[PDB]
Amino acid sequence: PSLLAHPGPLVKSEETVILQCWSDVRFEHFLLHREGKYKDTLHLIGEHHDGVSKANFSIGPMMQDLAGTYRCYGSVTHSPYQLSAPSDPLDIVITGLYEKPSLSAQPGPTVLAGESVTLSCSSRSSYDMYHLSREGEAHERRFSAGPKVNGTFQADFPLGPATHGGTYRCFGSFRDSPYEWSNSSDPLLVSVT
Structure with a gap:
């Protein structure tokens, strides 16, 4: 699973950014995970189009607690979700x-x-x-x-x-x-x- 920020990983305080998880692998679910002392996980139902699975997570008005390293996972089970291998890490920072x-x-x-x-x-x-x-x-x-x-x-x-x-x-x-x-x-x- 791949992860990229839109428009990018540098996020102005209180604005919002979209982190998109996508894969060729048809996942029904995508879990966006943030590491650190504010670790958390967001879940979104996947969407398939031109043979690809993807999810767009809207990272709420940018706040300090939302900044850090992120990784996503695809999953096909029902909670507790059985997770795939993580995407490459992506740092998001608040400016x-x-x-x-x-x-x-x-x-x-x-x-x-x-x-x-x-x-x-x-x-x-x-x-x-x-x-x-x-x-x-x-x-x-x-x-x-x-x-x-x-x-x-x-x-x-x-x-x-x-x-x-x-x-x-x-x-x-x-x-x-x-x-x-x-x-x-x-x-x-x-x-x-």
């Missing part, structure tokens, strides 16, 4: 809780293919961790304040040789609450020619 950092490009937003571009994320408020996100991509990059316990005001993300353009966003977070992030910085569209 919009702290002052957005500033995001900028060293060469600049417009660069030549093959030339190096570096993004800097900064803030007058210290963050223990900075996150660099690119629209359309799952992997995120991180920069830690490290062992030091008083956060850091800046994070540089060298992207290396420009290859394809993209829209970037960065966020700050604290060590004691890793799934809770700041408001997004203004998006930075990078163009390569």
Whole structure:
């Protein structure tokens, strides 16, 4: 069973996101499970169309307790449901809780293919961790304040040789609450020619 967030895993406080469970395997039920100290499971009757089974879970107005790692399971029995193998884990985080950092490009937003571009994320408020996100991509990059316990005001993300353009966003977070992030910085569209 596969699991993906719509429109994505970064969820603004109090908004809602949809986590969709789907498989080729015709499951009558789908159980969306959240790990952690707020572990829980949601259940939805499956739906089959072009030979595929899927369920859309609406993750209620985003709240801190709803953030964390999720996994779903297909099932074909009646409660207690006999569960299939879990999907790959998917982290969901709540954003919009702290002052957005500033995001900028060293060469600049417009660069030549093959030339190096570096993004800097900064803030007058210290963050223990900075996150660099690119629209359309799952992997995120991180920069830690490290062992030091008083956060850091800046994070540089060298992207290396420009290859394809993209829209970037960065966020700050604290060590004691890793799934809770700041408001997004203004998006930075990078163009390569």
